[PDB]
Design a protein around this nucleic acid. Structure first.
Lengths: 37, 133, 126, 136, 192, 176
RNA sequence: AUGGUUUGGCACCUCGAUGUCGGCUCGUCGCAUCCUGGGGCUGGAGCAGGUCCCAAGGGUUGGGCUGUUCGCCCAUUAAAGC
RNA sequence: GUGCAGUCGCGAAGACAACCAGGAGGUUGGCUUAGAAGCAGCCACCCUUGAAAGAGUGCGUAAUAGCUCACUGGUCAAGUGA
């Protein structure tokens, strides 16, 4: 879970959502998974 | 159902024989030697070949005509390819020989007529930097 | 799928129905590009087999003389015209339909009069 | 590196950061430009970084204009010295940049790559900025 | 050249000053000026949305058939007064026009270009000075660049015109320069 | 929206008690509960369906309408048929059996692991490496199934652990 | 951009006195965590790890040289915190 | 993330999504190849049956294969992307 204030949809399948007041990037590739914080 | 470009009177370079099709369990000898026989009866070019495998390793061998660029390499005088297509234009090629090639690529390709075959092959020439004048 | 291009498609539909003798729509489900290549390399001499848009035919169908076929827009519109003989067409569609065992024929229509499955088999025979 | 070959007066006051642009509020020589929004002093090294950012993002061919030149110096004075006793020497050179002013102009065909390049060059600078087309 | 001169309701101004003008811009109008050989400088307020539709449609130089005080009038847009940041339209000068007049004009070119691979274009200029008729100003001087090679300096006295239109910028100009295209190693030696 | 406006089919012996907002559905498998909030109305479509209705088209309503519809759909669907997930134990010397209601695993630990059946679900083993989880409350079913799934820390090298029947897991190689 | 511990900038209270480096004893506080505890990714096979998140409850050695803080070394340690 | 005012692109000729099927032959374009086959990279980036097919967008293979997408019609149906 790369924690960074900059997250992006790296690949074509990274979807950007918002849980509980935190931005997240969910993807089938766990290298890509990340969030603000 | 796997396809390759194999040299005419030769056999057993590892990458063009082993990894793509020599792993799947169709044996080296019978295919390669019947194909050497047939391909030296052709003795024409590096003939491409495709293999249809059925449910019991039954392999059927289909031969083709050699590539368009190689046909140009042998016919049109383009002995080496131009690293800058459309900028160094060292080929002036004749619609005559391109039309014999068009007859060949009609008996091979989706060609509509000899004209459309000539246009197709000239288009590959356009892409690889071969100016059919 | 721009509008005047859909008008062009309408023109194609009418200009082939009225410029051909036989006309039957069929179906394709279980058929691919290479099979179409076999077909249109073999019987492309005089046959006319293509595919078109149902929702486009919904507006194209009142420009030609097909005023009796305003109910058969359920199923993909795979058009079969021929310009010459009338028994070659449906029998040839049967040839290829058994060559693949995927091509269905919807119905029968030749010079206005509606014809069913067994009628189309009789059309093969004659 | 960008510097002048000689200035008459090599110790100048600090430029002003008051007012909006009068010129350079219009793309001139390319197609895709950069426009500032704030007041800031932009130096030599920043502009070098930015032009390199652009040339490593188009990489082949497509031209880049720099409508700015650092022709106004600033004076650091050496370290751990009590205030007073003169005015330090020029060490780095700025250009003032008032809002509305245009810095860079690209000429590359595809807008995708061009807009991306200008963005990479924006993130090498201290100012909020935006991207411009020559159109109205 | 079958132009439809756009129509616009304009009303003369009560107050002429900075406060009034800002209040007008705020409300959603744009002040404007009208003059020429009318020799009676009128001060108007147009409506900005309508004005922008007119411009976006028919280019910047675009004749107008105004409606002043119930009476109608004919005008041309000579000059605009734009803001840099917001890119509003702060003020607009308007030259009265009778039909059949020769007034000088400055329009924009359009590089319709697809070149050889080893080619790049450079637009040294956008704006060319012209005299034409009133109702017959163009919108886009289309210049085509296709099939051409490296250096081909498109001069200004090479563009195709209407019939009855004259070039008045000097024919020395480089409207375009077709450069020999750069190297990735030439891009290191430009501005360092 | 496109889901929240649809009416919901309702077969024969399917008794739906609309006690205001509180809803409760009886069928041969049980009598399930459901509740909803004050805003949205639960009208019974008197063709033999149920339909949701909302006053506003605001954020909350647009959100909550469709939810309620999908829930009641699952509800009646379960009480007709049910739900039954299938799970499959890939591994070496791994195994599953049953002890009455409660289920027993062998997953390489030094002690075996068991699970307490909750009230509303039952286990069903078809082979030592293959079983199911049959229930009605889809929440509960997938809950317990995933709890099982998370026992073994995943291992994408050799393919050990538990798998949902159609789970196409990822894989790598440690060649050396 | 932080933090305000470092070398410094200003000189605002204290020069009719605010006793200054280090050590000892004695604490107590922060977490930007050395170990223990939970965890996500791996160019993580396994043992060992690398980096990141949460986390302060407890613990966080004795010795040689130097007045020395800092440091280096020896022998151990779950660990030898800022 | 919302609420407001714009302008733009597409929509009962059926928008966007979804789901069935296609997703082609020149061709393993040229160079560089160890391998460079649609996919470290450099240049060109046209042509044809077709209803649609990019010198191919991503992932995967040392190279291939392969999962795929971009472009097309099908079953249902009002709005949807900048």
């Amino acid at each position: 879970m790369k924690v960074n204030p900059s997250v992006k949809p790296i690949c074509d399948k990274c979807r950007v959502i918002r849980r509980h007041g935190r931005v997240m990037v969910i993807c089938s590739d766990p290298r890509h998974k990340q969030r603000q914080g | 159902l796997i396809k390759l470009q194999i040299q005419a009177g030769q056999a057993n370079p590892a990458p063009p024989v082993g990894p793509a099709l020599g792993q799947h369990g169709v044996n080296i000898m019978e295919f390669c030697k019947a194909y050497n026989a047939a391909t030296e009866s052709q003795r024409g070019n590096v003939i491409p070949v495709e293999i249809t495998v059925y449910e019991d390793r039954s392999f059927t061998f289909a031969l083709k005509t050699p590539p368009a660029a190689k046909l140009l390499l042998k016919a049109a005088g383009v002995q080496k390819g131009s690293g800058e297509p459309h900028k160094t234009k060292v080929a002036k090629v004749t619609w005559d020989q391109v039309r014999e090639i068009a007859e060949t690529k009609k008996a091979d390709l989706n060609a509509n007529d000899i004209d459309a075959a000539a246009k197709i092959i000239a288009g590959t020439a356009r892409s690889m930097g071969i100016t059919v004048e | 799928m721009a509008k005047a291009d859909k008008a062009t498609a309408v023109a194609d539909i009418a200009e082939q129905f009225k410029a051909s003798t036989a006309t039957v729509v069929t179906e394709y489900r279980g058929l691919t590009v290479a099979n179409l290549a076999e077909l249109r390399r073999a019987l492309g001499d005089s046959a006319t087999y293509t595919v078109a848009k149902n929702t486009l035919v919904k507006r194209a169908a009142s420009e030609a003389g097909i005023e009796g076929l305003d109910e058969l827009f359920a199923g993909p519109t795979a058009i079969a015209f021929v310009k010459g003989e009338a028994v070659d067409a449906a029998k040839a569609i049967k040839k290829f339909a058994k060559d693949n065992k995927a091509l269905v024929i919807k119905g029968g229509y030749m010079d206005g009069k509606a014809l069913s499955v067994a009628d189309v088999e009789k059309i093969a025979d004659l | 590196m960008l510097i002048p070959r000689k200035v008459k007066h090599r110790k100048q006051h600090h430029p002003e950061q008051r007012g909006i642009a009068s010129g350079g509020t219009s793309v001139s020589f390319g197609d895709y430009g950069i426009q500032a929004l704030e007041h800031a002093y932009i130096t030599n090294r920043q502009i070098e970084s930015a032009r390199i950012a652009i040339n490593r993002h188009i990489k082949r061919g497509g031209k880049v204009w720099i409508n700015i030149f650092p022709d106004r110096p600033l004076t650091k004075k050496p370290a751990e010295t009590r205030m007073g006793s003169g005015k330090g020497s020029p060490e780095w050179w700025v250009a003032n940049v008032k809002p509305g002013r245009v810095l860079f102009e690209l000429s590359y065909p595809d807008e995708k790559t061009a807009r991306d390049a200008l963005t990479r060059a924006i993130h090498k600078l201290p100012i909020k900025a935006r991207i411009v087309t020559r159109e109205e | 050249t079958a132009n439809i001169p756009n129509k616009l309701t304009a009303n003369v101004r009560t107050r002429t000053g900075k406060g009034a003008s800002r209040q007008a811009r705020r409300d959603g109008k744009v002040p404007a000026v009208l003059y020429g050989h009318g020799t009676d400088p009128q001060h108007l307020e147009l409506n900005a949305r309508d004005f922008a539709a007119v411009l976006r449609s028919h280019g910047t130089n675009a004749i107008l058939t105004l409606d002043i005080e119930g009476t109608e009038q004919l005008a041309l847009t000579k000059a605009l007064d734009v803001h840099p940041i917001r890119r509003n339209i702060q003020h607009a000068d308007l030259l009265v026009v009778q039909r059949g007049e020769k007034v000088t004009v400055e329009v924009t070119v359009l590089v319709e270009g697809d070149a050889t691979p080893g080619t790049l274009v450079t637009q040294d200029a956008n704006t060319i000075e012209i005299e034409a008729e009133a109702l017959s100003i163009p919108e886009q001087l289309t210049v085509s660049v296709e099939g051409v090679e490296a250096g081909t300096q498109i001069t200004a006295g090479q563009i195709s015109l209407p019939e009855g239109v004259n070039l008045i910028s000097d024919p020395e100009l480089l409207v375009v320069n077709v450069v020999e295209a750069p190297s990735a190693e030439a891009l290191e030696e430009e501005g360092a | 929206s496109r889901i929240g406006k649809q009416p919901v089919p309702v077969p024969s012996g399917v008794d739906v008690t609309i006690n205001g907002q509180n809803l409760s559905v009886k069928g041969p498998k049980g009598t399930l509960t459901l509740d909803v909030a004050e805003p949205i109305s639960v009208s019974r479509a008197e063709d033999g369906a149920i339909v949701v209705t909302r006053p506003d088209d605001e954020r909350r309503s647009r959100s909550l309408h469709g939810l309620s519809r999908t829930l009641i759909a699952n509800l009646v669907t379960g009480v007709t048929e049910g739900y039954t997930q299938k799970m499959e134990i890939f591994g070496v010397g791994y195994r599953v059996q049953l002890k009455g209601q409660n289920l027993e695993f062998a997953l390489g630990y030094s002690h075996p692991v068991l699970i307490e059946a909750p009230e509303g679900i039952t286990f069903a083993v078809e082979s030592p490496t293959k079983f199911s989880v049959s229930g009605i409350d889809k929440q509960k079913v997938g809950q317990i199934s995933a709890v099982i799934r998370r026992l073994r820390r995943p291992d994408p090298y050799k393919g050990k652990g538990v798998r949902y029947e159609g789970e196409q897991i990822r894989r790598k190689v440690g060649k050396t």
